[PDB]
Write a protein that binds this ligand. Sequence first.
Ligand SMILES: CO[C@@H]1O[C@H](CO)[C@H](O)[C@H](O[C@@H]2O[C@H](CO)[C@@H](O)[C@H](O)[C@H]2NC(C)=O)[C@H]1O
Ligand code: NI
Ligand code: NI
Length: 175
Amino acid sequence: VVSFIGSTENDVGPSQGSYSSTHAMDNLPFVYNTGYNIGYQNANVWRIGGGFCVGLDGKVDLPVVGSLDGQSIYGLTEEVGLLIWMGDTNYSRGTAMSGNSWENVFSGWCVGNYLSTQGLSVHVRPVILKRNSSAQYSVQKTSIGSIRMRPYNGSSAGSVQTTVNFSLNPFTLND
Ligand SMILES: CO[C@@H]1O[C@H](CO)[C@H](O)[C@H](O[C@@H]2O[C@H](CO)[C@@H](O)[C@H](O)[C@H]2NC(C)=O)[C@H]1O
Ligand code: NI
Ligand code: NI
């Protein structure tokens, strides 16, 4: 059995985040290592119980502009892109996103005969695609994509809301 307990619209990263690097940025594309700082995380999005089995599918709506080590680079602007992970509650469980179709980002699990929750996480890392007369790049709030729950092994959603969305909070790149 399943119930929805989280938020439909979700913001990724702190509002007006500031990100900077000492690294050279002469070998483009360059990826800021923002760790898990630019992310959303919530352990309690659906409440599940009684043998219910569920996983997660993810979908990124941004345009693919390249790839880096087996995952897509998504374009925000002509000079700024994103590496995106989606998956289970833990950021370390994040699945490297590629393409614009629904992809399994959490194989799943089943609750025993007790009550628990299904959570999720999303985090991105900024990528410098091309140089710019600024050195300070500014990105506005942008829609990213969605995550839906994936009931499996007989379990069903019914009319319970399955899908939640994500928006990138505006930030600034420095140095
Ligand atoms: C230890 O108690 C419960 O055990 C189950 C099964 O291992 C699971 O760990 C529970 O945590 C949930 O795990 C889900 C998948 O890993 C995750 O989506 C949920 O966010 C977790 N819910 C939590 C931590 O409250 C855990 O309750
Ligand atoms: Ni290095
Ligand atoms: Ni829905």
